[PDB]
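Q: What does the assembled structure look like for these inputs?
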Amino acid sequence: MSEEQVAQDTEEVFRSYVFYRHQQEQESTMGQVGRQLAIIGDDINRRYDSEFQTMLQHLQPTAENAYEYFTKIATSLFESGINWGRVVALLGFGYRLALHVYQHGLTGFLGQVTRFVVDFMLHHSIARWIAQRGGWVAALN
Amino acid sequence: SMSEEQVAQDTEEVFRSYVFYRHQQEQEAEPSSTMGQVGRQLAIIGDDINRRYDSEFQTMLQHLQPTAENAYEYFTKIATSLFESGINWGRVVALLGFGYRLALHVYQHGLTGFLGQVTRFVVDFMLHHSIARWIAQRGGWVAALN
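A:
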């Protein structure tokens, strides 16, 4: 098989892995590969997952911090070489990191959308238009 | 005295109240600040023009399926194009409605809106660190199996 075809397959493998690990924690060919790898992380990947959940608990990541943190953890994991255990561990790390940038990303999203609106309105003279009308109370009449 | 800056501070309060009351209006029906009452009343007063914008925003977001990554770029292009033909009271209120739907879209989708970033981190790392070539030699992702 080719290097490029594995990269395309990885997207499918990971997305299936994430979905199935999430539902496993709660109480199509490459999809099955990801489906079979998610259930595996109950005995062997138990230590990797326990190590990943600990380091992300102290060092809380955001959608802007996520890259640096992913890279430094991933780089050091493959520093001593590549093996099947570390490859599957990178899928486990990706899952745990996604959970963290969703937890923080969820609770702060309205704040992102709030600034988008405020800024657009200020920068596009909409705020000055409203100010002439007599402010936001002029919308009521 | 009314200033452009004053309106920007007021907008934060208007929008946050609008979002909250628009969500309640949607869940229930199938000491708040002065600007909180403005945002609350705007969400309540639903006329043909505003229902028409919400139906258009619903359709845009259901098709374009914005993620938390392309949320800024999507907001900007929709907003910019909405004010392209000029400013009026109908479009100003519509921008509050768009903001609500854009927040609601991503909240309702969950992990799906945030995993795209992490997905490309994994793929890229593996490709650029020869992990993808290592797997390719083994015979692809099926070689990981028992």
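Residues 4-28 of chain B form the longest helix (25 residues).
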